[PDB]
């Protein structure tokens, strides 16, 4: 049983030319990688190589206009980069961003291919920039291409179109791009837990509410778990996994689990304001490993406290290697869970 790891310092080149201390920092990935080496997890993993996604692979989820626009930034002067970035919600662009977004997606392709062919059981991808806010036709929320959504489509393209892909997005923000790419799809089950605050938290859309259950034959395959009024932590996430995530996922019976593993719900995060501990992330990973015969690919999304993300992701990797989990309710969190249960009981007999 082998755990894969992909990391490439070339993804550090994407940077914010006007604010070098912007929280989506190059050192997010180098700090996480360093922590894996300090905790001796690195030596226990099989290094999987990064690669660039092809433009053909990007078109599995994105429009040729969007691909062309981001590609065009590779050679722009600073004023053109500043103006292009301002055309999106919460995006900065440098001459290296496009290449970095290709390396993030291609890293996860090589990881998924390694998992699906049996070279490894599971894998962790320490990649930048993030992916889950990227839409088919636009960048958003520090994300250019939807790495996790592309990986699901990539996985199906090397196996069969009906490969059941579960994407669990525990980034504190709603993966709006992912939700929309798979909204009419019952082959990819999208489950997101996110701070919502009645729609006032980023990305600021009612799309992220519990009543958005999917469209068409995707009805029931989009599970939104939104948190309101409370600084949520391990009890709230544990309970949502026990009551919702794990019962639905078991019924779906995925053949590969992608985690959109943002760590901005972590204790200490400057954007999330939540308090999931590193031990909590270990328990969420350990639960997901009981699906798909442990075929889990943990993909870095957000997470902006360098110490918190480095400890939290390392614990997820520790779980992937087979380590036993370390030892571990707000009233409004019960309201949320009950609201999602009512919305999804019609499509999931486990509920």
């Amino acid at each position: 049983p082998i755990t894969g790891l992909v990391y490439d310092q070339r993804m550090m080149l994407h940077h914010n030319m006007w604010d070098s201390h912007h929280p989506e920092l190059p050192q997010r990935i180098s700090r996480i990688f360093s922590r894996h080496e300090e905790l001796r997890l690195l030596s226990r993993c099989h290094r999987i190589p990064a690669r660039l996604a092809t433009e053909e692979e990007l078109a599995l989820c994105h429009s040729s206009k969007h691909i062309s626009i981001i590609k065009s930034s590779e050679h722009m002067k600073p004023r053109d980069l500043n103006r292009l970035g301002d055309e999106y919600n919460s995006i900065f662009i440098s001459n290296e961003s496009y290449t970095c977004a290709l390396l993030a997606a291609g890293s996860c392709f090589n990881s998924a291919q390694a998992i699906l062919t049996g070279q490894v059981r599971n894998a962790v991808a320490i990649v930048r920039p993030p992916g889950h806010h990227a839409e088919k036709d636009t960048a958003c929320g520090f994300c250019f291409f939807n790495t996790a959504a592309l990986t699901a489509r990539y996985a199906q393209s090397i196996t069969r179109e009906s490969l059941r892909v579960l994407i669990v997005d525990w980034d504190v923000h709603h993966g709006n791009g992912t939700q929309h790419i798979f909204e009419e799809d019952d082959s990819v089950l999208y489950i997101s837990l996110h701070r919502y605050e009645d729609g006032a938290f980023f990305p600021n859309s009612e799309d992220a509410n519990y009543d958005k259950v999917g469209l068409g034959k995707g009805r029931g395959y989009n599970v939104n778990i939104p948190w309101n009024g409370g600084k949520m932590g391990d009890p709230e996430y544990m309970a949502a996994f026990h009551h919702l995530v794990m019962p639905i996922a078991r019924e779906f019976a995925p053949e590969l689990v992608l985690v959109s593993a943002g760590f901005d719900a972590a204790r200490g995060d400057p954007l999330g304001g939540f308090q999931v501990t590193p031990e909590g992330y270990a328990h969420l990973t350990h639960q997901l490993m009981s699906l798909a015969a442990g075929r889990v690919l943990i993909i870095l999304e957000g997470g902006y406290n360098l110490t918190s993300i480095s400890e939290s992701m390392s614990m997820c990797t520790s779980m992937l290697l087979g380590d036993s989990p370390p030892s571990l309710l707000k009233t409004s969190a019960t309201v949320s869970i009950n609201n999602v249960l009512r919305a999804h009981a019609p499509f999931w007999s486990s509920l």
């Binding site: 912007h22 989506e24 919600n89 919460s90 806010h133 929320g141 006032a200 980023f202 600021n204």
Partner: peptide, 8 residues
């Protein structure tokens, strides 16, 4: 997403 303005 970052700034404090409300919809970023």
């Amino acid at each position: 997403x970052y700034x404090x303005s409300x919809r970023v």
